[PDB]
Amino acid sequence: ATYLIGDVHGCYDELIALLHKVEFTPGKDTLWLTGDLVARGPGSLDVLRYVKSLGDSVRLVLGNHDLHLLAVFAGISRNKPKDRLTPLLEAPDADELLNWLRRQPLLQIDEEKKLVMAHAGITPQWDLQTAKECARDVEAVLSSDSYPFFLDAMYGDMPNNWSPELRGLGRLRFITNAFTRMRFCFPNGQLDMYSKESPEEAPAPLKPWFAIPGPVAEEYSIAFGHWASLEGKGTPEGIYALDTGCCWGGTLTCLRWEDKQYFVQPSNR
Template identity: 65%
Template sequence: MSILLIGDIHGCYKELRSLLIQVAFNPLKDTLWITGDLVGRGPNSVEVLRYIKSLGHSVRMVLGNHDLHLLAIYKGIKDNDPKYNINQLLIAPDVDILINWLRCQPMLQIDNKYKIVMTHAGISPQWNIEIAQMCANEIEAILSSNNYQLLLNNMYNNKSNNWSNNLTYLDRLRFAINALTHMRYCFPNGQLDMICKDVPEKTPAPLKPWFSLPNKVLDNQYAIIFGHWASLAGTKTPSLIYALDTGCCWGGNLTLLRWEDKQYFTQPCF
């Protein structure tokens, strides 16, 4: 049995299947962990969703910002910009089934046996693992409910960038979505910067990558697995931090980490 952790797929279905052949993925024995952003940018988002859904309990995934954005487009809250490359998905005969499956997926995965924590973008330095779980559960509860449009209507707010136990319900949800699906840089106090997307070498002070700040999750010796940040490819991360997005949809690679021996496998963009 293998734990196979894979970075952002972004509709790169052929690369996904080729990469899984490399590692002889067996859904009857292995578990495939996915850092989110199944859809968007790449050419085959609908095939990716159908395939991942078909794997059932062999998959442990989290939602990314592109997955949430798809939900907003589907509900007419956001325009369908051609750059997202999801027209094929939106007109698919099973789109309703796929959307309802997608919105019931987790925001956070924690495995206490293997000491793994996975989110799309990372874990806020202002959180401990209990707060992260609480916030993820709140998002999951409303996304999987009949009121999920309330969240989609209110989730776009870059000003929700500083954690407090006194945040209102919607502000708490917005901060959690920003931290779990958009975060890259933080100020020294852990407040999120929602603007900078440069590589760390080009980032002005005082901003630091979120994983460069002290993190209570790491204090408990959990590894943090994340995607979202394709330009990090090749950038060294601290111990117990694993960045798996290597920009397949941008012409880079799709990357997989086999957990038991920490071996990486890559599939270049076709």
């Protein structure tokens, strides 16, 4: 069976309880995770240890909080007490866990399922070939010995409009924002980097990225997490918003792909 779970955010107990509910069995089953494995919840260390131990039984994409953790680890960004990352940062296997984390993908594709997953979704300005090339470019910088330089370069809100002509810092910044921060678009597909509200509460003319028809969404299903204020609701057919806000006091959601059956674990917070 194939299971897809939204943002875990250190909610180790809820993750394990949800996997027991579906009798997840590595070697018979595969787990997809939308990213944001860490921060806010109490168990980021246990979450990373477990997810790494799954090997080929898990398909992860990196989220914005995963990248922030890497930036803190690398001395690029300051640790926020609210993120509850110190046990992970001080763990004896921190290097092993975080060097594994920075090598994980930004994008997962299964052609037999016609299924695409990224943390925030796929911007309507990208076709599949472009999304794959952009994922490969940022994965390359994150997997390299010089990854702290990129992590520092990644911060920024512009450019917010994709072009194949983009180069350098702006190209990397856009790619990072599209895969890990995107929620709303202007009518032309350009990214808004400020509104984090639900679609009904957003100021005009902003619309959810998935409300603008794009080439990837026309041919593939897209699963994503990230957008907690969406509450996993209000999406079109073929769009699966899996982040139901577990670390916020909401729920952890698991979707089984074969029958599109949902399983939900209440937050312990």
